[PDB]
Amino acid sequence: EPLESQYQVGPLLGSGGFGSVYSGIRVSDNLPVAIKHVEKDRISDWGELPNGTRVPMEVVLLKKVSSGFSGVIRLLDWFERPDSFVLILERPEPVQDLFDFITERGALQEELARSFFWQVLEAVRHCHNCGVLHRDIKDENILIDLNRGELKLIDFGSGALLKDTVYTDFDGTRVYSPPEWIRYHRYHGRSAAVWSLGILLYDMVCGDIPFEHDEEIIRGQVFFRQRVSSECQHLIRWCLALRPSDRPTFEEIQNHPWMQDVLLPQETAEIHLHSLS
């Protein structure tokens, strides 16, 4: 019941301002899992469980989006310790994050970028429907299930419950925050999320982020370093509109002509993942 009596702790996988995750195996079915640790001190936002229970905001959000949809990692269970919380997350294999995939393969072909981007749009949408706003959409927070060709949104450590009123707080990735944040320290979830989606898309087709400094983010001029179709460039420029109100809705993004005829997850893997190239 403790924890070790259920899971077999393995080596260290990753770590950062979000936590320290270790490889793990569940005893009973040797099901591959990821064990994430978080110190109660490092925690900034807390929440109440559906049964009123002081817990990390991450746990709250994870349980709200944890169902059948394989678009976001599932929180299998969580434990509490005197100075930390432990999260048991599902862990697919083989797996590689979008950031390493991009760093390794470089700019992605548009066909593959369309499939990938489409899948994260569906995942983010899933979250919003469950009342969850991620706030840190970026290549590093997206895993690729190499065999299935399915992407998975991870790390809700900077999330928050979704609301229709302004947000005055933000502890996500700077280079992905919108010009409203940088200039006024306030924003709205959905439109701010669309902004990070545009950054992501650009990152997919160009191999790198488009902005580095606050002035670049505020100016909004987008220069393409790689050959990108006019439709894809237009979608990106549209998501990257300086004025939130001028950004497209998720519906408009998925209805955009560049977004059409997306490849099925399995076809994607068969065509772009199952290979040495």
Who's near 257: CB < 8 A, 6+ residues apart? Answer: 231
Annotated catalytic residue within 45, 83, 100, 136: 136
In terms of domains, do 42 and 127 share one? no
- Look at residues 74, 93, 112 and tell me which one is the last residue of a structural domain: 93
In terms of domains, do 226 and 121 share one? yes
The answer on whether 157 is annotated among ligand-binding residues is no
> Distance (Å, rounded) from C-alpha 17 to C-alpha 29?
31
The angle at the Cα of 33, spanning 40 to 56, to the nearest 5 degrees, equals: 20
Resolution to 1 decimal place, in Å: 2.1
In terms of domains, do 125 and 206 share one? yes
Could you confirm whether 261 is annotated as catalytic?
Answer: no
Is residue 237 classed exposed, middle or buried when 0-12, 13-18 and 19+ CB atoms within 10 A define those classes?
A: middle
In terms of domains, do 188 and 67 share one? no
In terms of domains, do 129 and 221 share one? yes
> Distance (Å, rounded) from C-alpha 187 to C-alpha 228?
29
> Distance (Å, rounded) from C-alpha 120 to C-alpha 71?
7
In terms of domains, do 45 and 11 share one? yes
In the chain, how many domains are there?
Answer: 2
4 lies in which domain range? 1-93
In terms of domains, do 87 and 197 share one? no
In terms of domains, do 225 and 116 share one? yes
The answer on whether 14 is annotated among ligand-binding residues is yes
In terms of domains, do 58 and 140 share one? no
Of 156, 159, 121, 131, the C-alpha closest to 141 is 156
> Distance (Å, rounded) from C-alpha 156 to C-alpha 124?
12
The answer on whether 231 is annotated among ligand-binding residues is no
